Amino acid sequence: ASLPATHELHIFGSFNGVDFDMVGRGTGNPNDGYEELNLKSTKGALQFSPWILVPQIFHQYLPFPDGMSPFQAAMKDGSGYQVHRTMQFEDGASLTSNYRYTYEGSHIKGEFQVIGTGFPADGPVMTNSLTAADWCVTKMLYPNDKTIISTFDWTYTTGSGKRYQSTARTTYTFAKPMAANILKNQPMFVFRKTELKHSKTELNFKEWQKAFTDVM
Amino acid sequence: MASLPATHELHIFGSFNGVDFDMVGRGTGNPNDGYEELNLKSTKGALQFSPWILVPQIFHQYLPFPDGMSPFQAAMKDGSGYQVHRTMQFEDGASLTSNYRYTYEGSHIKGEFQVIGTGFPADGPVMTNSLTAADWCVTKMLYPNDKTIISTFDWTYTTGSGKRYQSTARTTYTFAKPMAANILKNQPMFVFRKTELKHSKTELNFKEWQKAFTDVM
Amino acid sequence: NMASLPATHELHIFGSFNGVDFDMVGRGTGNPNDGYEELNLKSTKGALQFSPWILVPQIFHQYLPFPDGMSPFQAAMKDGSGYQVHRTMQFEDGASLTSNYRYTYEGSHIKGEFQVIGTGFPADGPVMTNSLTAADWCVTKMLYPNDKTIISTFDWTYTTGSGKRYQSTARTTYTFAKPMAANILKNQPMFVFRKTELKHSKTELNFKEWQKAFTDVM
Amino acid sequence: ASLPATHELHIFGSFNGVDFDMVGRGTGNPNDGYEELNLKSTKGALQFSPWILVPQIFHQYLPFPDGMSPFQAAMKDGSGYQVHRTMQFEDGASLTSNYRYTYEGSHIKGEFQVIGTGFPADGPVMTNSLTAADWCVTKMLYPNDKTIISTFDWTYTTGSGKRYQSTARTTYTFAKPMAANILKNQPMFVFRKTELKHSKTELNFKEWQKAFTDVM
Ligand SMILES: [Cl-]
Ligand SMILES: [Cl-]
Ligand SMILES: [Cl-]
Ligand SMILES: [Cl-]
Hints:
Green fluorescent protein blFP-Y3 (chains A, D), photoprotein (chains A, D), Green Fluorescent Protein, globular
């Protein structure tokens, strides 16, 4: 019906075969790409660094340079989209996820399944040694009118000073075609910053986004 | 009643390019030589994609090792079991991720497989139903710790045009209890496999042969 | 002494594509205050049997300024210690393109020796059929795992005559003889937005590049 | 014009921008794939683990199950082939190389250029922590009559107990078309074992090879 004002997320799955589950609510601004979110565990203490859930934890808040993003258009007309993300880490770990949304006016309900495996017991994720996520640029292309393929190199800083790297690849599938003005402008880049304050069981997340085809 | 498997059943489901699919069926196998065969039928009408893309998605509990039980077999016997997480990244940009869960009762396996595929082009061999066969394949397995197997292979199909359709496969196995020392000593462990698939748009018959080895010579 | 940011450069670029040798030589200029470069190259061994677009971005980061001052490439030229470049590119159709760049400096002038080896480009692919029409505008990500190394990554795509893009994954390692300055090392990651243009025949090309480094667009 | 009995190698290039150069002589058996090689450094002590020159340091010794490999056939008629190898390591290092050959009867002369970068100072290569190369299966496909694409996951055991991994990819380009009996029989696998006895300045290398399409 309209652009998003609020949202809620049920995020669940497993890391190294041990189940996790978090729920919570959030808000954001569709005019500038800002979004905020609180999450609490429903199954006790998290076994892994909560930073590994960034960027898992809402592009319906992202505007484009000259109008609505395809994500925003898909929310307004109700046809929507599905997300499918893969992340391969330097130390052999793999993190795959799928996002499903439903829309109630200006409210979004997220159901995000997230499966992580192969994270070494002594690596930065399982030892809670991640400190921050690097600022990041995503490259988006449109191989057809109902598909976005997004790529970025994702890196955390760790307590040792070494970075922890992964190669991210995200596919968006739309039920209806994206508008002609979106498809004409390829590639579309998105710069993003994130912040996360976390405990063993709870986290508060913030994101800022800016889309651009050109910086000159 | 602990045993190696004689029969299995599968519920396999998920989506390809945002379109849901669901199949169910039953199979048998020989855990002395890695043979298995499976019949599946669709529960949501005709499949929108090449049934070959469900191989190798569609049971390593049938695989023996050269010196004795595989960790897959050992985890079935004692009932502690394992989970499977597979990622396949295709040459044309498509991605196929999946997650396998099992339950056991004696010599019978019940499989619940979730499979999500996206980014398969409209004119690619998956969506045009142009995959003709799966190449015979060698998997490499390593054990980074006593409860994890990392499996890698280069997965290729033949197509109608003669061009092969390629993907890079990575599979993680996560066990509830430690694998035995006789398993962990032999690294890398390689597995040579062959597959056959007869299919319509609603039904398929799958066969697989397997042979594990550390040394060809 | 003549320690300087670059005004001019020359390039000898050579190696092979699908086992057939090629060799080009030429001269160029640029503006190290805004990242602009222009380069003219001519073949010394006949017609190029591959799309000249496959030599982008092979065909000078000494022209790139950073937002707050010199880039490490500029600083390495200014003091003469310099750097080596090692680039790998893996293409969607299974082709492989690896290269190594060596430089010498005389004041504001750069001499480049670039070795470039391409293999596995299919006979009916867009490179060997001269079907590449342009290179997409592109954002590179740079990180510094130590004081003498830069690791760079980008997803590199061309438009083609068929209408569908030709993709590769690019990874570049820069190795510096002396440590990079602390102010450079503090600002990570450093992104670089770039545009390119290429006019070409089978034996000659005119290349243009525009660059803009940034840690933040907001 | 002959199958190989002996060979010599000049291997050179750099690791992390530092030049290296080795020369030496070897023998092998073209009827079973065995080859042995001894090399000496010409620029003093090597600054890296000599294990990182495996598998860099002669498929002209490899037979196929139905006769000559394409590598053997290319030597026997003199048309030959070029090799182009890329290896991407788990800690961010890259190793690329190019091999050229000339033939003098049953004697091969190899000129191999090897460039390695991004090997961290505390990684297994630069600390000399590699203990052995894992036994390995290569997969070979022929996308056309003059090209072979070789893939393998390459791992060393180390002194820490953790393996050191890379993803290896090799392209062979032939001057003449390979024979029909090769092109139809895809994929071709090759199982190999290696042994290395090394010092800072000298090494003895051994390799055993076996090509197969089916082990049932
Ligand atoms: Cl994304
Ligand atoms: Cl597997
Ligand atoms: Cl770069
Ligand atoms: Cl090889």
